[PDB]
Write a protein that holds these residues in place. Structure first.
Motif, PDB file in Angstrom:
ATOM      1  N   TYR A  50       0.810  -1.214   0.000  1.00 27.01           N
ATOM      2  CA  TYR A  50       0.000   0.000   0.000  1.00 27.01           C
ATOM      3  C   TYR A  50       0.845   1.266   0.000  1.00 27.01           C
ATOM      4  O   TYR A  50       0.362   2.321   0.418  1.00 27.01           O
ATOM      5  CB  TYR A  50      -0.937   0.038   1.207  1.00 27.01           C
ATOM      6  N   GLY A  51       2.094   1.193  -0.452  1.00 30.72           N
ATOM      7  CA  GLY A  51       3.002   2.316  -0.353  1.00 30.72           C
ATOM      8  C   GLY A  51       3.358   3.014  -1.642  1.00 30.72           C
ATOM      9  O   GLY A  51       4.273   3.850  -1.640  1.00 30.72           O
ATOM     10  N   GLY A  52       2.687   2.716  -2.740  1.00 31.71           N
ATOM     11  CA  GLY A  52       2.946   3.400  -3.982  1.00 31.71           C
ATOM     12  C   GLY A  52       2.244   4.735  -4.041  1.00 31.71           C
ATOM     13  O   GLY A  52       1.347   5.049  -3.246  1.00 31.71           O
ATOM     14  N   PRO A  53       2.649   5.557  -5.004  1.00 29.44           N
ATOM     15  CA  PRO A  53       2.010   6.858  -5.177  1.00 29.44           C
ATOM     16  C   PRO A  53       0.600   6.702  -5.714  1.00 29.44           C
ATOM     17  O   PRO A  53       0.239   5.635  -6.228  1.00 29.44           O
ATOM     18  CB  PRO A  53       2.922   7.567  -6.187  1.00 29.44           C
ATOM     19  N   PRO A  54      -0.230   7.737  -5.602  1.00 29.48           N
ATOM     20  CA  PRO A  54      -1.597   7.634  -6.116  1.00 29.48           C
ATOM     21  C   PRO A  54      -1.603   7.338  -7.605  1.00 29.48           C
ATOM     22  O   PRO A  54      -0.732   7.782  -8.355  1.00 29.48           O
ATOM     23  CB  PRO A  54      -2.199   9.010  -5.815  1.00 29.48           C
TER      24      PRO A  54
ATOM     25  N   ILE B  85       5.947   9.721 -11.514  1.00 31.92           N
ATOM     26  CA  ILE B  85       7.171  10.070 -10.809  1.00 31.92           C
ATOM     27  C   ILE B  85       8.295  10.278 -11.815  1.00 31.92           C
ATOM     28  O   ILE B  85       9.000  11.286 -11.774  1.00 31.92           O
ATOM     29  CB  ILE B  85       7.557   8.999  -9.760  1.00 31.92           C
TER      30      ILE B  85
ATOM     31  N   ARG C  62      -0.277   9.559 -10.659  1.00 36.16           N
ATOM     32  CA  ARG C  62       0.815  10.429 -10.225  1.00 36.16           C
ATOM     33  C   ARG C  62       2.107   9.901 -10.834  1.00 36.16           C
ATOM     34  O   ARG C  62       2.660   8.900 -10.375  1.00 36.16           O
ATOM     35  CB  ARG C  62       0.884  10.476  -8.705  1.00 36.16           C
TER      36      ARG C  62
END
Ligand SMILES: CCCCCCCCCCCCCCCCCC(=O)OC[C@H](COP(=O)([O-])OCC(O)COP(=O)([O-])OC[C@@H](COC(=O)CCCCCCCCCCCCCCCCC)OC(=O)CCCCCCCCCCCCCCCCC)OC(=O)CCCCCCCCCCCCCCCCC
Ligand SMILES: CCCCCCCCCCCCCCCCCC(=O)OC[C@H](COP(=O)([O-])OCC(O)COP(=O)([O-])OC[C@@H](COC(=O)CCCCCCCCCCCCCCCCC)OC(=O)CCCCCCCCCCCCCCCCC)OC(=O)CCCCCCCCCCCCCCCCC
Lengths: 93, 93
Positions: free
Chosen positions: B84-88, B93, B91
């Motif tokens: 659950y730690g990726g960017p929205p 990068i 979005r």
């Protein structure tokens, strides 16, 4: 004379006790009001209104992105970092 | 059977009218082959098979899942980060 018919134990116990109470509340209620002991919903003191009139919920200033103000003329950072823009997983409106 | 202290208030032994055959251990005696335990029915020892089997399965699942997470998900700081730690979404990068 002619009041003796009323004078009675029950009529006396509710006259001394009840009258004592009539003075206990008449003399204590103002003190409770002054010392904020009365329930707020029943009544609000003038001091309560004076403080509450100074409260608003529309101030959107002072947002900072650092834990410390290290003095100077620049002050704490106020601009959101670029790497943090668009990083929130907000549910669809 | 329990403590010698617990007992029936009235000492009665039932005159069982049922004709069921006697369990073998009920009529058993101590024997040279069975110095102890002759009054207890023999049973299967499930623990000897179930404990080592269950332990192996849990270890395999534990390790296999850990390897999988750390090799089939994008690199991250923790397991919860890799899930659950990726960017929205959307979005870049
Ligand atoms: C149909 C249904 C289907 C269903 C399918 C799904 C089912 C469910 C699947 C679930 C899958 C879950 C997967 C994840 C599990 C959690 C993993 C975890 O938390 O760890 C990472 C987690 C977070 O770290 P991470 O970032 O994920 O880890 C990075 C990796 O380690 C990156 O590796 P590294 O490079 O950092 O590693 C360095 C290495 C250190 O390397 C070395 O020191 C070894 C190098 C040489 C290797 C070759 C061997 C040479 C000889 C070595 C001799 C060693 C012994 C010598 C004597 C002792 C010396 C100390 O350290 C380790 O490897 C650490 C572990 C060591 C072994 C621990 C025991 C196993 O670590 C912890 O939080 C620690 C563990 C906490 C949770 C466990 C607590 C255990 C408590 C006891 C009861 C447990 C009951 C469990 C029941 C489970 C039932 C299912
Ligand atoms: C399928 C899934 C299978 C899952 C199987 C179990 C996985 C266990 C491993 C795991 O999830 O590790 C990440 C998990 C969550 O950490 P994370 O913040 O996502 O990753 C660490 C960040 O890189 C860095 O964040 P941090 O710097 O804030 O550090 C957070 C803390 C992560 O651990 C904790 O925060 C400890 C959690 C218990 C807190 C209890 C506090 C009690 C009160 C103490 C005083 C006040 C504390 C206030 C805070 O780091 C190490 O303890 O915590 C661990 O590393 C181990 C947890 C299990 C022990």
């Amino acid at each position: 004379g002619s009041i003796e018919q009323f004078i009675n134990l029950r009529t006396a116990r509710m006259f001394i006790y009840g009258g004592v109470s009539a003075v206990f509340l008449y003399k204590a209620t103002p003190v409770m009001y002054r010392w904020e002991m009365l329930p707020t919903f029943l009544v609000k003191t003038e001091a309560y209104k004076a403080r509450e009139a100074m409260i608003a919920f529309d101030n959107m200033k002072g947002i900072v992105y650092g834990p410390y103000d290290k003095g100077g003329l620049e002050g704490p950072p106020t601009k959101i970092p670029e790497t943090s823009v668009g990083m929130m997983k907000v549910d669809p409106m | 059977r329990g403590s010698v202290f617990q007992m029936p208030s009235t000492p009665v032994y039932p005159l069982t009218t049922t004709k069921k055959v006697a369990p073998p251990t009920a009529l058993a005696k101590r024997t040279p082959e069975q110095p102890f335990g002759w009054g207890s029915p023999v049973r299967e020892d499930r623990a000897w098979r179930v404990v080592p089997r269950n332990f192996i399965i849990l270890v395999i699942v534990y390790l296999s899942g850990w390897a999988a997470i750390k090799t089939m998900l994008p690199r991250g700081g923790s397991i919860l980060g890799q899930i659950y730690g990726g960017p929205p979404k959307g979005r870049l990068i």
